Design a protein around this ligand. Structure first.
Ligand SMILES: O=c1[nH]c2ccccc2n1C1CCN(CCCC(c2ccc(F)cc2)c2ccc(F)cc2)CC1
Lengths: 166, 210, 210, 210
């Protein structure tokens, strides 16, 4: 029971990683109900008293949730860009043109890596200029991403800057 | 009375959102603003026999100038309705009773400044439009709608997106100032956004720990 | 005498703004220059009869060096007028009592550092101009003034906008370094910004906490 | 002995700068490297009859590993000199008293992390040229030296400039990752840059108050 909770947290991280990714990339309709597995995060929400023993554990958890929200935003971004694609506008067409794989199109690995890279650059406020929103849906998604990204950036990194002394 | 002032705050936020938009993007329904101004007249009637002179000596004039209809550049006089923000500024103690309320107020004012700067950005872009240098021409080309050009929705979304990116210090590169007026306004927006982040999110860090 | 210090501070701000700008751009009004020189001569005269010996060893040499005209490129020696900053540097006791004064000083030093970096950026971009890779060629190509070339106003606004975007961590992508000297200067600007942005905005957050 | 400690710190900085640069770029002078090796041999000799037992069972293994010549890939095997950083990491007491030497050390480790990331970035980029995709091809196109391509100076300056921009969250848009390896490396660089910003410059904000 002492080490059961760490394994439970690792498996909940696994399922919270691989449910949105599958539901956003691998469909290419009753299987959509599998998205309800995300409710398992309440276990790690309620086990904070046991998880927060060490400050390095809190830093690892903060990095993990930042990466997790980046992954979820990447999945949403790919879903948005995939809905518009079969209807040179949109990020998927530009990505296919850039890597020399005209839309066929880029492989799933390339699309996921591009989406995660764009989401990380937006959340960290770098904006490399390689990937830029170009449609109304993409622009509104970007606006929401920067809003909640300012919020989560402030909260997460203020917590980190408070803990680092400890 | 608390519910009344919270509803007053909601209506103040509504008019602050909808006045600059109608000033800039419109003038190329009215039932909502008619209801809002009628309800604000009801509020000023509530705010006023012994305390009427005290209120008249205090904040009566500021509300009065912001409550007189301008029905008779001619249509631009409605920008004076933005003065109602001090109605919320004067009673900030009531709103600062909870940490969540302060957090929501900070986010709301950040979005409100972004909206106001978006309206100013569109006004700057439009005043130079009839003179491929401005941002409106680039927007038209990128969206595949070369200059009727982009619609009102596309133009507002692009202005808000550029303003949010500049304030948050992302700089996506899709929209970049190209004329001197755009460059100066962008410098001002960068300073405003730096101040926004510093002050607001220092306050946010202060609240979250408690 | 009571208000002489703030007038001297304003004069120092003026010369700090207009000496690097003149040296970097206008080398290829004199009345205000003469007025400023006469005002500084008056200041050094009244700064002084048993205390003259104390000043002779204290700060007279620096003020005398910064006050002597160099007219006999003779204009490059006029950069010595930038030495007047020690007058406000040493008098920090008076200027650090009002919190609003401290905030205004921080804003002015941010703007001054950005202006100096813009002047250095233009000097770098112009020293390599006669040698399609520099930022001046791209600026001329993108604003519709192909090299001729852009006006002085356009060049200054572009340089200041690039410097502000670099210091504020926006990086708009309109102006991007494309030469070894430009890239090295951009790295130096990145380091100086990492220090100065953090320090100044931490101080500003501290004042806001008050 | 303090002079010896500071000289050893300077030599540690030198080797941490020049062995990864050599490994990344110069593969496919030596007098200074030989002098530094002899100096570190002198240092490990100095590190030593009652005290030799403590050193032999203490830090002698790491120092011996970092001091044994590998002149029998040798160019890649010379990287084993990077373990000399423990020699400064284990004497942090001596380098924490000036109150500004530690700030200089923070700036130096900023520059060192940026330089190492630049070396890794160039190592990633150069391995893909045999296989207009890649940052080296774009660099060649931009600076007007199409792929023989850019010189070693241009490649190093571009790599360091991109790494600094990524860490400092500017993203100038001149250099942008395009391959999966470049994108993943950039993701990692952004993450470590954010974390290092938080930690290191929280420490810097704490230190600048004194
Ligand atoms: O405001 C925001 N809204 C946002 C919304 C979403 C996401 C982020 C948002 N953000 C902030 C993100 C962090 N960013 C400051 C980084 C300091 C940086 C630096 C460097 C040089 C410089 F000149 C200025 C700033 C630096 C980086 C690494 C370091 F090690 C040290 C300092 C300010 C914008």
């Amino acid at each position: 029971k002492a080490v059961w909770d760490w394994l439970i947290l690792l498996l909940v991280i696994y399922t919270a990683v691989f449910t949105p990714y599958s539901a956003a990339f691998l469909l290419k309709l009753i299987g959509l109900l599998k998205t309800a597995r995300l409710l398992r995060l309440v276990r790690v929400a309620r086990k904070l008293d046991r998880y927060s023993e060490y400050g390095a554990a809190v830093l690892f958890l903060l990095m993990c949730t930042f990466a997790l929200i980046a992954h979820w935003l990447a999945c949403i971004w790919y879903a948005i860009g995939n809905m518009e694609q079969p209807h040179r506008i949109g990020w998927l067409h530009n990505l296919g043109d850039q890597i020399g794989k005209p839309y066929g199109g880029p492989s799933i690995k390339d699309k996921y890596v591009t989406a995660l890279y764009f989401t990380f650059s937006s959340l960290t406020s770098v904006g490399f200029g390689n990937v830029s929103p170009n449609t109304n849906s993409e622009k509104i998604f970007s606006i929401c991403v920067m809003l909640i990204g300012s919020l989560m950036y402030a909260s997460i990194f203020g917590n980190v800057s408070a803990i680092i002394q400890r």
